[PDB]
Design an enzyme around this catalytic site. Structure first.
Site, short mmCIF file in Angstrom:
data_model
loop_
_atom_site.label_atom_id
_atom_site.label_comp_id
_atom_site.label_asym_id
_atom_site.label_seq_id
_atom_site.Cartn_x
_atom_site.Cartn_y
_atom_site.Cartn_z
CG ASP A 334 -1.95 1.20 1.14
OD1 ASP A 334 -1.77 2.25 1.84
OD2 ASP A 334 -2.84 1.08 0.30
CE1 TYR A 465 -4.23 7.64 0.68
CE2 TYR A 465 -3.76 7.87 3.04
CZ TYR A 465 -4.14 7.09 1.95
OH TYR A 465 -4.39 5.75 2.17
CG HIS A 523 -6.08 -2.98 0.58
ND1 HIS A 523 -5.30 -2.38 -0.40
CD2 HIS A 523 -5.68 -2.44 1.76
CE1 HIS A 523 -4.50 -1.50 0.17
NE2 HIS A 523 -4.70 -1.52 1.48
C1 LIG Z 1 -11.67 -2.74 0.65
N1 LIG Z 1 -10.48 -2.01 0.21
C2 LIG Z 1 -10.02 -0.93 0.96
N2 LIG Z 1 -10.66 -0.56 2.11
C3 LIG Z 1 -8.94 -0.21 0.60
N3 LIG Z 1 -8.49 0.88 1.34
C4 LIG Z 1 -7.17 0.87 1.98
C5 LIG Z 1 -7.08 1.87 3.13
C6 LIG Z 1 -7.52 3.26 2.75
C7 LIG Z 1 -8.86 3.26 2.02
C8 LIG Z 1 -8.96 2.21 0.90
C9 LIG Z 1 -8.21 -0.60 -0.65
O1 LIG Z 1 -7.21 -0.03 -1.06
N4 LIG Z 1 -8.71 -1.68 -1.33
C10 LIG Z 1 -9.82 -2.40 -0.97
O2 LIG Z 1 -10.17 -3.33 -1.69
#
Ligand SMILES: Cn1c(N)c(N2CCCCC2)c(=O)[nH]c1=O
Ligand SMILES: Cn1c(N)c(N2CCCCC2)c(=O)[nH]c1=O
Ligand SMILES: [Mg+2]
Ligand SMILES: [Mg+2]
Lengths: 546, 546
Positions: A334, A465, A523
């Site tokens: 991420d 961000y 995720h």
């Molecule tokens: C469900 N979901 C999800 N909550 C996110 N988040 C990560 C944290 C910040 C908001 C978005 C993602 O990047 N991909 C997904 O699939």
């Protein structure tokens, strides 16, 4: 009634046993059957081997005693030992041959999980050979899963002497009829049995597990495939490094070998790598699991610009400098993923290898402002929601439990659409007050994150961000470059934001890029599919970072 | 007026320079003189090499550009490049050939010590070669001694463009006439000179130091041999591990490679190893410098038995376990020395190698009680003084400054006889209120120890002496053993308590024992003779722990 399980090491938790290297050697070499075993036991309670097992003498001191025993036995059996016969050699090989019997460890783990006190009780030796590290490693890998490890050579007693079983009982704080004890040597069972312990004679593993399963009434065999080993926060070594006057970085550290630095996403923690930390150490790496700036026990200055990529990367470089590390492997997820790609692009001399989970590398577009870029994907709308200082903070901080319980969910359990977050007024405007617990996390785990976020909340994390323009301008400097160090991109099928298709053009900028891909994985990659993440990482480290 | 010194890297802080590998290669290979240099500079401000030095492209991307340059130059010079001609090869070798020019680093260190702001300003590149670690290591070893390192490829500017000198001035926060700037390339000096900077054209080092010495008015050449690099406590990575509910151990950690665990004496600190910590890291080791139990930021429980050897050693084992280390090299001094010999005797599987400074290994005498043993040496009388809880505490705690200033003294500066301490009533009854500062320590260093001892005082440390009977009984278990792992004993000529003769029979218990011996060295070995300690340790590690 049964509260405790006790396992031997040789032939029970680890295979093959060494006594069976004496037998195999006699065969291999066509010596009289039993000769080596006779030399081994020569002298019974007063012989070299009991002295060894009691800690009176070390392995190396014992070796020539066994030697002599073997000569005396071959003289009375009127045979010759083979030219180049070598006890050191026989045992070196035997000790390195022996591995953890995984099904037995898995049954012990299971019994401990349902509340058994578990112990390893072993006849062993003080190992001073040049090759002793091998055994030290095994014992480390084993002993961490148990309440106690009792070693004959540390306590000055041995199986089958009854005093060791009394010492065992006292260590367990249990009475004999609460204990099941497993051994591959029947004479070693006999005293356990005299006291009224359930005892299991272990020949093949599966049969002993059958008996263990029947006697405890807990499933041990055919059970589903268990998770990797997790981390207990208070058993970890915690590290702290000041990278500049107002900023210290916290990390957890485990293992030795090439340094591998783990960089978590938003809004996470070092603890997001809890499934990978023991596996990568075990695989022969020095793991450093960070709290990234803004998180957990790392510093969290208020100012936006403290969290632009340029500063974040320079601070990671300072981190290696103060630790005295010329390189680390950087593995991110991420936000941590975006960062490691930048480390690769701006400090390749300091990155041994780079990997990212979920986060693709997409070069900045020098013609399109990143704000405009962001508006181009409906699923990045949450990013605009995150811009206005204070707004996302108030929602995310209002109820920490509900925050983590809403976010941390597997792909078939989602409760938040990422759709029109700005228009809705929030990330949770349309999800429960008290969410149910995801299959991925226990209640205790949600609460660790809740406690972590009580230190600084969401300002620092959200700030990551809030530098879209500054990171864009910086990233534009690197558009002429390619990433040519070793690199691994891991896509997750069901991440609905960082979709696998977003990574498709990566080979244009990273031509030797390697890939893994994880199906059915949302995720929160590390916890959603910890077993497959570990396999893909260890396999890539071993081939590309080694 | 001169407040700042600025050094180039290639040809100034590191030799030989690479431009001189182009010249050497042309010769070696009998190519037209200058050909390689022409290919290198081809295109001037718009050429491949300026792009490289500006961070636009990486080293690896540049290599085939240089290649092409070389072909074009050899075509116009109407010569052939040699079969197997290889830029990658030429530069790989050149970059690994280049070492720190020690006399220049020593002059920079000296100028910084007398208050100069120091900087490295270099035309360099983003190095992505398979062999990049080499250069990463050099830059780490160099950059730690300077206030700034400015790299062309991080800032997007290069010498001789004037904007870099303006960027330099702004980083220094100094005006041109306060700066001396040294370079081996005259064209690079020219803009410094235009602004009114003192500039030094560096050919041979000694001449440039002569000019630098004259212009700053500080001795740089022929100066005495400097100390090794010391540690600034707030630049270190600090580690913490809980080994059991009431006890956490603190350590400082630096470097990568085999783990080397440093164990200080009474009444000391991790900081007692400040001269060894940067040298052993630099030598290719992972240093872990402990606060031992009872000290500094480690826990200090009140109870005597918490400090018997058995418990102390088991806790050190737990320390490796939680860190995920199967082994460490254990190096101890004074009490830390006695401990490591016990680690060798009771956990040889966990000790890669053992060394002790000052502290000999003397097997327990099974017939003589250790109290009686102790009375047998007039110079161990201080040990009896230390028995009665509270007595030594009150003397040692009363004035911390005076305590450390009295103890920490070189052998020709002593102020405490160790003679009839009990009879005198104290260790300091006959020494000054305000002792003078030993040559060995600065005032600041005394004060670090004073601040450390303010956390727990002298109860925990003194406790280490209060288990003579318990350690004796434990040690008696090990009388049948020998130490057969690698082992180094270091005697110090003028330690009047742990005299070198006390170590004389060691080979009876440690037959492959290695030795060093340090003349003119008192009890506080690490700080009294840090240069010779480092040489003896690194030489032994490299040959016996590697
Ligand atoms: C469900 N979901 C999800 N909550 C996110 N988040 C990560 C944290 C910040 C908001 C978005 C993602 O990047 N991909 C997904 O699939
Ligand atoms: C001068 N001196 C000295 N003070 C000590 N002490 C170490 C700390 C405890 C008291 C004794 C020593 O062991 N050898 C010496 O030579
Ligand atoms: Mg067995
Ligand atoms: Mg130069």
């Amino acid at each position: 009634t049964l509260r405790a399980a006790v396992f031997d090491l040789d032939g029970v938790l680890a295979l093959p046993a060494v006594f069976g290297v004496l037998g195999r050697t006699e065969e291999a070499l066509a010596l009289p059957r039993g000769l080596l075993n006779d030399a081994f036991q020569k002298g019974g309670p007063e012989g070299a081997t009991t002295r060894l097992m009691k800690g009176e003498i070390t392995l190396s001191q014992w070796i020539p005693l066994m030697e002599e025993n073997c000569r005396k036995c071959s003289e009375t059996a009127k045979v010759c030992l083979p030219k180049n016969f070598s006890i050191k050699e026989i045992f070196d090989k035997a000790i390195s041959a022996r591995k953890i019997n995984r099904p037995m460890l898995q049954a012990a783990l299971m019994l401990r999980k349902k509340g058994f006190t578990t112990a390893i009780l072993t006849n062993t030796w003080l190992d001073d050979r040049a090759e002793r590290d091998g055994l030290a490693q095994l014992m480390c890998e084993l002993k961490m899963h148990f309440d106690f490890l009792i070693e004959s050579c540390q306590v000055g007693m041995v199986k089958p002497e009854p005093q060791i079983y009394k010492f065992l009982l006292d260590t367990l704080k249990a009475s004999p009829s609460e204990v099941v004890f497993l051994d591959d040597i029947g004479a070693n069972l006999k005293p356990a049995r005299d006291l009224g312990m359930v005892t299991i004679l272990v020949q093949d593993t599966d049969t002993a597990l059958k008996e263990l399963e029947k006697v405890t009434g807990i499933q041990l065999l055919n059970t589903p495939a268990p998770l990797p080993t997790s981390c207990n926060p208070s058993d970890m070594s915690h590290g702290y490094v000041t990278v500049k006057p107002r900023v210290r970085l916290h990390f957890v550290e485990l293992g030795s070998g090439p340094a591998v630095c783990l960089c978590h996403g938003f809004p996470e923690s070092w603890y997001s790598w809890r499934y990978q930390i023991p596996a990568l150490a075990q695989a022969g790496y020095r793991v450093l699991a960070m709290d990234m700036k803004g998180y957990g026990e790392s510093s969290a200055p208020p100012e936006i610009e403290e969290y632009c990529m340029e500063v974040l990367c320079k601070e990671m470089v300072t981190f290696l400098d103060k630790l005295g590390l010329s390189q680390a492997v950087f593995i991110g997820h991420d936000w941590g993923g975006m960062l490691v790609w930048y480390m690769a692009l701006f400090y390749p001399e300091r990155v041994r290898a780079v990997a990212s989970l979920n986060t693709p590398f997409i070069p900045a577009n020098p013609n399109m402002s990143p704000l405009e870029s962001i508006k181009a994907n409906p699923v990045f709308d949450y990013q605009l929601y995150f811009q206005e200082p204070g707004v996302a903070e108030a929602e995310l901080e209002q109820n920490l439990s509900r925050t983590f319980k809403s976010l941390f969910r597997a792909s078939d359990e989602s409760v938040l659409s990422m759709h029109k977050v700005c228009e809705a007024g929030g990330l949770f405007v349309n999800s429960p007050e008290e969410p149910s617990l995801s299959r991925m996390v226990t209640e205790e785990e949600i609460q660790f994150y809740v406690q972590q976020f009580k230190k600084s909340g969401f300002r620092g994390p959200l700030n990551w961000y809030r530098n879209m323009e500054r990171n864009w301008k910086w990233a534009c400097k690197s558009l002429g470059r390619k990433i040519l160090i070793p690199a691994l991109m891991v896509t997750a099928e069901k991440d609905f934001v960082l979709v696998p298709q977003m990574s498709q053009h990566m080979e244009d900028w990273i031509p030797h890029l390697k890939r893994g891909h994880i199906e059915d994985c949302g995720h929160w990659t590390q916890m959603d599919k910890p077993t497959e993440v570990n396999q893909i990482l260890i396999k890539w480290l071993d081939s590309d970072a080694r």
